[PDB]
Amino acid sequence: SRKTYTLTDYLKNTYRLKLYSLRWISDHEYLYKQENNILVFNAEYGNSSVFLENSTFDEFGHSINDYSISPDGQFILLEYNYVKQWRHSYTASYDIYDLNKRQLITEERIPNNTQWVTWSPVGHKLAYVWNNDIYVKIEPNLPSYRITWTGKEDIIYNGITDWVYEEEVFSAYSALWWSPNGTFLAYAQFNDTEVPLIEYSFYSDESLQYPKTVRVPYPKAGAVNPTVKFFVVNTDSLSSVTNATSIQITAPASMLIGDHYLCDVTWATQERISLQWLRRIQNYSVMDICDYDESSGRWNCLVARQHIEMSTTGWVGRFRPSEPHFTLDGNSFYKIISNEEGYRHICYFQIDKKDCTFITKGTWEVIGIEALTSDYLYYISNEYKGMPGGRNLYKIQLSDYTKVTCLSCELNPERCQYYSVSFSKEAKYYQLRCSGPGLPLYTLHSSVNDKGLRVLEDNSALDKMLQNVQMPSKKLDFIILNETKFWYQMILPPHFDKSKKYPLLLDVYAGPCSQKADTVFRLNWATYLASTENIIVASFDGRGSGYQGDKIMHAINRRLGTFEVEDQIEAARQFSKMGFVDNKRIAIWGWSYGGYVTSMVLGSGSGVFKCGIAVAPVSRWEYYDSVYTERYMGLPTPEDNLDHYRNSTVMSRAENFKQVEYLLIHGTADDNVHFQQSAQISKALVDVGVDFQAMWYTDEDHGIASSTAHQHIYTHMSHFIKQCFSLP
Amino acid sequence: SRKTYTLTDYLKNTYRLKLYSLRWISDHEYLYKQENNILVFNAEYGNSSVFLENSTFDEFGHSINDYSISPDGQFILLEYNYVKQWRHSYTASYDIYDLNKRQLITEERIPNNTQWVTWSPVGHKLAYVWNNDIYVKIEPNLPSYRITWTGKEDIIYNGITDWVYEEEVFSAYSALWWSPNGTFLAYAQFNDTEVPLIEYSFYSDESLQYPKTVRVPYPKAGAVNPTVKFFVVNTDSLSSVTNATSIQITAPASMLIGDHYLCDVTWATQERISLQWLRRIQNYSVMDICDYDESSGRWNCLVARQHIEMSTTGWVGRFRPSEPHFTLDGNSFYKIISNEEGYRHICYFQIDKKDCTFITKGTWEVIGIEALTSDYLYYISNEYKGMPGGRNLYKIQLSDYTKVTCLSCELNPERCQYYSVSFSKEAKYYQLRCSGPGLPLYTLHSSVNDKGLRVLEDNSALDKMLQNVQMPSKKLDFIILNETKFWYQMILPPHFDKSKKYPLLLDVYAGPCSQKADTVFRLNWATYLASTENIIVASFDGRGSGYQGDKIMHAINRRLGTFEVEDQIEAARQFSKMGFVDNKRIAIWGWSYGGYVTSMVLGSGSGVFKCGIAVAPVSRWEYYDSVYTERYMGLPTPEDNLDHYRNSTVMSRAENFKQVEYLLIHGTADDNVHFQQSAQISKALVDVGVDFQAMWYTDEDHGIASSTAHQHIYTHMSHFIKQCFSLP
Ligand SMILES: COc1cc2c(cc1OC)[C@@H]1C[C@H](N)[C@@H](N3C[C@@H](CF)CC3=O)CN1CC2
Ligand SMILES: COc1cc2c(cc1OC)[C@@H]1C[C@H](N)[C@@H](N3C[C@@H](CF)CC3=O)CN1CC2
Ligand SMILES: *[C@@H]1O[C@H](CO)[C@@H](O)[C@H](O)[C@H]1NC(C)=O
């Protein structure tokens, strides 16, 4: 009788999840936006005031995209004229507003087309990047100091990342790091001079008579990478008539030997910086510890205090070497490291001592370190009930490592199994964020005795509405393969009957260190497919998946397109032998890495799958970027791993596609997984005489995320699946 | 006849048409290659010998693409290493072979990557173009003379055409014209300095890591055009000590005023050249008659012999001003011109005299002048039986214009209604070739008494095969609209039955001066659809179509995407009201201009069509090239024709596509109708939420002609049409 969850509900965001995004501003207060007011909340009591009225900036004359308020809170940055670049990068204009006065600063403004801006961590200093060069304002209404003069578009990057560093290393556009004082400004310089360029057409509005050619420095597998240098400037000693001095910190000898990456920059104290470096063969990394000399005014990284992290079985880290969390005095730190068993746990390092001490252990993994006080370290793990797809906050007493308390496990075990956390400065309070299996729940807690303070957002409005709809359910469980537990989830249609045979859609990603079987609550395409179309949407975490130790994660080493493709095939045969799937209506779809696996599955000749959809897939690893590809594959040389680079293409399997119905989709302005990749798949299918379906999205990138394109692609894909499953 | 005409019959050329391509080498002999042997034929008697044995070049080491024998029979050009550029252009390598001996010439070879080669019309002088420069050899074994020193890739073209002149004007890569003596070499020079570039990706073989960007000087509508200069060089006065001297013939004062083009080049005598020029606004053209000055070494074009061809109702010529046919003495010529009533007929021009004399008249059109003697003019018209889609050879006694013989009409009237002709030098003999309605038939005749000599190829081999296949039939008729006849054709299924109702596919082109209803015999996709799938395939020649007078052809002046679209809709409507058509199953499809019309029809909201396919369509006239577009559209300025440019796009009709099923196909390496055109169509449909089907062909151009791609596109369109029509 109830209404079902329709395609229009998903596409038009009918049932919206409520959030509670706060920004901690001290040990005891946070900011929060309510009816476009910025409010300040008191954590202990819950009382709030208005930080900045909504009626302010009504007369501004531009839509304010974002704000950033100075640490010692006298000013606010007004971000406007936002223009997106890649995943993280963008460009905007900035006004500064004097909070103690009534006024906007009208003099010595931050330029338009600024690439990145940051307040110092204390006070109100400003560092920004404009035309690839760094600038510093000591006071908001005073002239900026020019730190660098070398910045050149697409060639020299000062204080910002280039394409690969942004995407694959720092996950940020920024390459600026203030010291905790704000005295020193550390920054990276990238040089792309010999990095080859990827070129593609941008069609723009119909009024553009000639297409534009977009050109991006982008190193493909085995090509010339950018080079990096690292600098630190003393911001306290700047002159308005004399160019500033930047002291270079050079990478260790064991890196300078060949191609290498800067991997991590972490300030330890007011005068000590930590730097991680990684070799182009991502087997070997080095932590440098560099102290400032008050005498010479230089930085020195003592060779004897270098920490080395290498891997025997795979690469280093999950996607990169993990970051250190330093103790207040800067002499010791904690870092997630893979133990002797291959499970990732917290190791304790002391700076002039050689090894480290493991502080956690077991057949589970630490996801992240979240806070460190003198008495406690707070971390998230998937320990609870041996479920790799669950997430919980834990707390260790530093006086006794075996004294561990779960802080979130038993708060609401039916509703809440997937937490993240946001601590205040000094971690006097924390916000817990639950994500599933039930509706998201946001709560405020106090650290002293771990008291629940206040519920912040419980999604009761959403709960009301969803009782009027035939919601699907989710099963999360595991199967055994060669004496090993591999997890899966199923999104089961309402009124699920185990004697009826249902069509199954296999939803795949399967990238290295991925997880698609978990406990989070989602409203998405699969929700629609199960609720309205009565399709089972399964996902499975095979070899190469993350969070279950290295034996599973590193099984895929030097061998992408291999075990992770077999394990999706085998999971579907498994699901077949369960009594409720129609083994004649098994489909497969995935996006990105998911597209590659879908395509590799479809060209396998398994016979299991009737049809599949690949959206923006990798087709050949030599087409993807160097930092990512080479991490899992090594180099595409006969000396190294060429043979498997050449055996793991989608193209090589073109004949086998005559046994399946295939939908290939790609955005034309994909800067990440180039349209080229699908252009080669289709060319190979034509050459072999294999009919299939295609769809390009003009001027869309990897997300195909514009409002109209997003609605279009999901509409197109639904038709294809329904016709494949003979659904009306 | 049991077995049907299949898709695989079409795709694999199961039923090959035989041809008889001969090369006249004198008044009374021709060359003809048979297997790999070049034979020489005597026209009067029929006897023949092998001119060049297939064995001759067994040990050459390259497959030869083509041959060219010098007009004196002493030497042969061997073309190999053929690489296609655009529709007509290509590069190749050339060796010369002395025939009197039996030897390859090894010194002073024609270089690799030669862009064009031509023998003089008499003897064995060679002229060639390499790296955009002209060279001349007086003797095959001797060093070549460099004529031009200004050639520059994509900038200066000497003796070859740039993209637009090749495609739109000359239909040739060549821009060289030897005089009938071989004394003078005339040539054009093109300057693309300021012409904007179309840029698109080319992905190449799988091995290519980074796609290429192809960049072509290509003026879109209203953009900066190339400039042209004309030069004549004397080939008898060349020195291997001094640089060659090129004499410039400048355009007439009435062309020099604004942008213009070189239209036509036709030598009159050993010392007289004819030149036609056209204003960028192509309703005004000027013919210049230029004579050589023996005393000064110059060329003068007197205004007394200048002729103006202009048009009040449209543009000049069918696609360009027509070529002159001069009498031997060079003092007069014949030319196809639109008469007072707007029908195209032969005018007789005397060189220093005003006006011209129409020698033909009537409500029909001369297609071409084919040969001129002292006693007779030979031309092709559609006069016979008042059928615009028929073609016959005629003969005029020049002493009395009213005395016209039809030479081909009654030769075989049920089988043969569409002729072309090839006359020998001095026209003592002619090859007639008929193309339909029956199987092609090749015959030889002598001009003395117009006696049939010999049948050359009668396709009797194909006739027997087709006897054993269920072949469709062709209906050619007309319908009346206002008070005008508009012709159509239907390919009808075998065993057609007017009491039954058939699905109907409209096959559309409908560009200006097109004819889709003719008497030609074809084996194509439509053959398969009628024979195997029992679909009627209709084509219709409405307003804008050719060979019926300017009142019909010029209807579309300044107004593309109007009447020609309207008329196709009416045609389909009329076919509905015919008792043998199922009006719930009417489709439409077209390529290039036809894809544009298909789309405009599908976007019309007429309700007549269930589905349609557009291959490589134009979507907006500002995207197509200046020379073709401005001919019909004028300039896209507010003081010219911007409003109808803006009102005739496919994109603006996007909302209307929710009422139909649409398949859109484009090759990504289309240098002619750019992928941009379909890219914009798809974006418009997405912006408006219309589902449709798509298919790109990576690296395919306007023809989508590579054997795998050709097979793949027609397979794909066959599926689309079959499911649109509910055909199993
Ligand atoms: C936790 O931090 C990270 C998480 C993740 C990543 C990087 C991180 O930081 C380095 C990478 C970056 C990579 N570019 C992305 N891929 C794979 C490509 C298809 F094979 C297409 C594409 O966009 C996959 N994600 C997976 C999740
Ligand atoms: C008889 O000589 C000619 C015959 C023809 C033409 C030119 C001639 O002389 C130069 C033109 C040239 C034009 N480029 C071509 N189109 C139209 C475009 C679609 F809008 C895409 C495309 O390729 C259509 N053809 C039709 C036949
Ligand atoms: C909360 O209330 C206290 C006591 O009235 C007040 O001093 C404080 O400013 C309040 N905090 C906020 C954020 O309004």
Tokens encoding A121 = 């961590």
Question: Which DSSP letter does residue B567 get?
Answer: H
**Chain B contact set for A620 (CB, 8 A):** 206
Query: Of residues B670, B671, B678, B701, which has the active-site annotation?
Result: B670
CA nearest A247: which of A232, A265, A262? Answer: A232
Take residue B381 and report the two structure tokens written for it.
Answer: 């018209």
At A399 the three-state DSSP class reads coil
Please name the residues in contact with A73: beta carbons below 8 A apart, sequence gap of 6 or more.
Answer: A25, A99
Which residues does A40 contact at the CB level (< 8 Å), separation at least 6? A25, A29, A30, A31, A48, A49, A50, A51
Q: How many CB atoms lie within 10 A of CB A659?
A: 16
CA pair distance A61, A56, nearest whole angstrom = 12
| Residues B258, B159 contacting (CB under 8 angstroms) | no
The enclosing domain of B423 has a CATH number of 2.140.10.30
- Rounded Cα–Cα distance for residues A546 and A513 (Å): 4
Conformation bin of residue A62: beta by default, left when phi > 0, alpha when psi is -120 to 50: beta
Neighbours of A37 (CB within 10 A): 16
SS3 B460: helix
Task: Please identify, by atom number, the ligand 3 atom nearest to the C-alpha of residue A42.
Answer: 13
CA distance A35 to A14: 20
- What is the distance in A from the centroid of ligand 1 to the CA of A168? 7
**B536-540 vs B485-492, strand pairing mode:** antiparallel
Q: Are A591 and A616 in contact (CB under 8 A)?
A: yes
- CA angle at B292 for the pair B286 and B295, rounded to the nearest 5°: 145
Question: Closest ligand to A46 CA?
Answer: 3
Kind and range of the H or E element at A682? helix A676-688
What number does the ligand 3 atom closest to the CA of A40 have? 13
In whole angstroms, give the CA distance from residue A82 to residue A79: 7
Query: Under a CB-based contact definition with an 8 Å cutoff, are residues B314 and B512 in contact?
Result: no
- Report d(CA B9, CA B2) in Å as an integer: 15
Ligand 3 environment, Cβ below 6 A: A 29, 40-42, 45, 47-49
Distance A319 CA to ligand 1 centre (A): 8
Q: Which of residues 192-231 of B touch A (CB under 8 A)?
A: 196-201, 203, 206, 209-211, 213, 220, 223
C-beta separation of A243 from A146 below 8 A:
yes
Considering only CA atoms, which of B311, B260, B271, B265 is closest in space to residue B288? B265
3-state secondary structure of B475: strand
Mutation target to probe the B interface, by most B beta carbons within 10 A, among A197, A199, A210 is A210
Q: Give chain A's end-to-end CA distance (angstroms, integer).
A: 19
User: Mind telling me how many Å the CA of B218 is from chain A's nearest CA?
Assistant: 10
Contact (CB, 8 A) for A679 and A668 = no
What does the alpha-carbon distance between residue A124 and residue A105 come to, in Å, rounded to a whole number? 14
Per residue, what are the HEC states of B146-198?
ECCCCCECCCEEECECCHHHHHHHHCCCECEEECCCCCEEEEEEEECCCCCEE
C-beta neighbour count of A665 within 10 angstroms: 25
> A471: which residues sit within 8 A by CB, 6+ positions away?
A5, A494, A527, A531
| Short-list A484, A479, A522, A530, CA closest to A504 | A530
A446 and A582 fall within a common domain: no
Going by C-alpha positions, the residue among B358, B363, B362, B338 that lies closest to residue B348 is B358
Q: Which of A403, A427, A459 is the last residue of a domain?
A: A459
Give contacts of B 594-623 with A, CB under 8 A.
Answer: 620, 622-623
Decide if A680 and B206 are in contact by the 8 Å CB cutoff. Answer: yes
Q: What is the distance in angstroms between the Cα of B722 and the nearest Cα belonging to chain A?
A: 15
Residues B696 and B587 in one domain: yes
| Residues of chain A positioned with their CB less than 8 A from the CB of B223 | 209
Note which residues in 431-490 of chain B have CB less than 8 A from chain A: none
Chain A positions touching B674 (Cβ under 8 A) are 211
Task: Count the neighbouring beta carbons within 10 Å of the beta carbon of residue B405.
Answer: 12
B400's CB contacts (< 8 A; 6+ apart) are: none
Three-state SS at B233: strand
CATH code: domain of residue B508: 3.40.50.1820
Residue A707's H or E segment, with its range, is: helix A707-724
Residues in CB range of B1: below 8 A, 6 or more apart: B467, B468, B469, B470, B471, B494
Closest CA–CA distance from residue B60 to any residue of chain A (Å): 31
Buried-exposed string B479-491: b where 16+ CB fall within 10 A, e elsewhere: beeeeeebbbbbb
Q: Are A691 and B676 in contact (CB < 8 Å)?
A: no
Dihedral angle computed from the Cα positions of residues A562, A566, A568 and A574, in that order, rounded to the nearest 10 degrees: -170
Nearest CA to ligand 1 atom 11: A168
Please indicate whether residue A174 is annotated as part of the active site.
no
Domain match, A428 and A450 both: yes
Q: Tally Cβ neighbours within 10 Å of residue A298.
A: 13
For ligand 2, atom 9: residue with the closest CA = B319
SS3 A362: coil
Contacts 24+ apart (CB under 8 A), A126-129: A127/A159, A127/A176, A127/A178, A127/A185, A128/A94, A129/A158, A129/A159, A129/A160, A129/A176
Written as one letter, the residue type at A647 is N
Residues B394 and B501 in one domain: no
Q: Residue B240 burial (CB < 10 Å; 0-12/13-18/19+)?
A: exposed
* DSSP string of A623-655, one letter each residue: GSBHHHHHHHH--SSTTTTHHHHHHS-SGGGGG
With a CB cutoff of 8 Å and minimum separation 6, the contacts of B471 are B1, B5, B494, B527, B531
A47 CA to centre of ligand 3 in angstroms: 6
CB A430 within 8 A of CB A34: no
Binding site membership of A511 for ligand 1 (Cβ less than 6 Å): yes
Last residue of a domain, one of A459, A485, A506: A459
Give the integer Cα–Cα distance in Å for B295 and B271: 13
Which residue has tokens 């079959």?
Answer: B722
Test B689 with A709 for CB contact under 8 angstroms: no
Q: How many helices (H) and strands (E) does chain A have?
A: 12, 45
List, in order, residues 6 or more apart from A61 with CB less than 8 Å away.
none
What is the rounded CA–CA span in Å between residue A306 and residue A285? 10
Any catalytic annotation for residue A62? no
Mutate to test the pocket of ligand 3, among A23, A34, A47, A454 (most ligand atoms within 8 A of CB): A47
Structure tokens at A313: 């079985």
Q: Are residues B472 and B452 in the same domain?
A: no
Distance, CA of A333 to CA of A326 (rounded, Å) = 4
Q: Which residues contact A60 (CB under 8 A, 6 or more apart)?
A: A78, A80
Asked if residues B394 and B405 have their Cβ atoms less than 8 Å apart, the reply is yes
State the CB neighbour count (10 A cutoff) for residue B449.
6
Query: Residue B462: enclosing H or E segment and its boundaries?
Result: helix B460-467
- In this structure, what DSSP letter does residue A424 have? P
Catalytic residue status for A63: no
Q: Whose CA is nearest to atom 3 of ligand 3?
A: A47
Listed in sequence order, the DSSP H helices in B603-724 are 626-633, 642-647, 675-687, 707-724
Question: Per the residue annotation, which of A260, A325, A345, A702 is the catalytic one?
Answer: A702
Residue that terminates a domain, selected from B459, B485, B518: B459
Domain that includes residue A547, residue range: 1-13+468-728
Same structural domain, B537 and B411: no
Please tell me if the CB atom of residue A545 comes closer than 6 angstroms to any atom of ligand 1. no
Q: List, as one string, the DSSP characters of B660-677.
A: SEEEEEEETT-TTTTHHH
In eight-state DSSP terms, residue B416 is: B
Query: Three-state secondary structure along B315-352?
Result: CCCCCCCCCCEECCCCCEEEEEEECCCCCEEEEEEECC
CB B717 within 8 A of CB B686: no
A652 touches B: beta carbon within 8 Å = no
What is the total count of domains within chain B?
2
Q: Which of A563, A567, A561 is nearest to A538 (CA)?
A: A567
Same domain for B635 and B508, yes or no, is yes
Cβ separation of A211 and B199 shorter than 8 Å? yes
- Report CB contact under 8 Å: A623, B715: no
Q: Calculate how far, in angstroms, residue A628's C-alpha sits from the geometric centre of ligand 1.
A: 8
A666 reaches B (C-beta below 8 A): no
Q: How far apart are CA B641 and CA B630, in angstroms?
A: 10
CA pair distance B217, B200, nearest whole angstrom: 12
Alpha carbon of B43 to those of A519, A700, B20, B122, B441: distances in Å?
89, 65, 14, 21, 17
User: A484 CA distance to ligand 1 centroid (A)?
Assistant: 26
Kind and range of the H or E element at A145? strand A145-146
Could you tell me if A8 and A60 lie in one domain?
Answer: no
For A351-462, strand residue ranges (E) read: 357-358, 366-372, 376-381, 392-397, 400-406, 419-423, 429-434, 441-446, 451-457
Q: What single-letter amino acid sits at A140?
A: P
How far apart CA A513 and CA B698 sit, in angstroms, is 34
**Rounded Cα gap, residues A486 and A553, in angstroms:** 12
Asked whether residue B203 falls in the same domain as residue B266, the answer is: yes
**Same domain flag for A504 and A410:** no
In a 3-state reduction of DSSP, which class is residue B461? helix
DSSP secondary structure letter of residue A17: P
| Judgement on whether residues B391 and B472 belong to the same structural domain of the protein | no
Q: Please list, in sequence order, all residues whose beta carbon lies within 8 angstroms of the beta carbon of residue A548, skipping any fewer than 6 positions away.
A: A365, A388, A541
Which tokens go with B544? 């804008």
Instruction: Map tokens 């330029």 to a residue.
Output: A111
CA pair distance B637, B649, nearest whole angstrom:
16
Q: What is the resolution of this structure in A?
A: 2.4
Going by the DSSP 8-state scheme, the letter that residue A535 receives in this structure is -
d(CA B156, CA B228): 10
In this structure, the answer to whether residues A715 and A672 fall within a common structural domain is yes
CA distance A555 to A553: 6
Contacting residues for A207 by C-beta, under 8 A, at least 6 apart: none
- Enter the tokens of residue B25: 């080498």
A497 to chain B nearest CA, in Å?
34
Type of residue at B32: Y
The DSSP annotation for B9-20 comes to HHHHTSSPPP--
- Tell whether A406 is within 8 A of chain B (Cβ): no
DSSP three-state, residue B477: strand
Output the furthest CA–CA distance in chain A (Å, rounded): 83
Residue B560 contacts A, CB cutoff 8 Å: no
The two structure tokens encoding residue B672: 């002619």
